[PDB]
Symmetry: D2
Subunit: 30 residues, 4 copies
């Protein structure tokens, strides 16, 4: 239901934040 | 540049995760 | 219970990520 | 420097949020 869908979406959103964060960390190392 | 865009995206992704989490939180107490 | 505690912790963790992200975004602007 | 430390902390915070979210996800299906 809504709660489950919300947590799945949240996890997906966090995954996207993480991959963008990794790109940014690499960019700073240069 | 890429680093700035990445952090902006990450912040937006986290905002999305937070609002879904708040929905889930309310659903639980419901 | 555990689910509620988990979501509260998760929200707190995300809040901490967000404030660190804001510091980083400011640092890049300089 | 500060920017690097901030992103490292943010990434660690998000990791923590994700593991709590996975616990919550399991609790729901339970
Ligand atoms: C990567 C960079 C590049 C690649 C990496 C991919 C992902 C992530 C990073 C990273 C940033 C990079 C670069 C940059 C390119 C490039 C590519 C690569 C892909 C990848 C995807 C993601 C992912 C995020 C990640 C951030 C992160 C930002 C970084 C930037 C730029 C920039 C730009 C490109 C471009 C493409 C495109 C891909 C697309 C993916 C996603 C998302 C999004 C993330 C963001 C965003 C930032 C931002 C932009 C664009 C842009 C968009 C788009 C795609 C999107 C999308 C997103 C963002 C866009 C935009
Ligand atoms: C701020 C910076 C500074 C202030 C801002 C505060 C918060 C956040 C940022 C930011 C980064 C900054 C600077 C830096 C100082 C400074 C201060 C300020 C405080 C604040 C707290 C948070 C918060 C995070 C934020 C990040 C972010 C990093 C940034 C860095 C350094 C650096 C450093 C200092 C120092 C203090 C200290 C405070 C403490 C808070 C938290 C957390 C943590 C966040 C992280 C971490 C990064 C990292 C370190 C330390 C360190 C620690 C500690 C405190 C901690 C803590 C954390 C991290 C430590 C560490």
């Amino acid at each position: 239901a809504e709660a489950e869908s919300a947590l799945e979406y949240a996890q997906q959103a966090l995954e996207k934040a993480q991959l963008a964060l990794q790109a940014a960390r690499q960019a700073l190392k240069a």
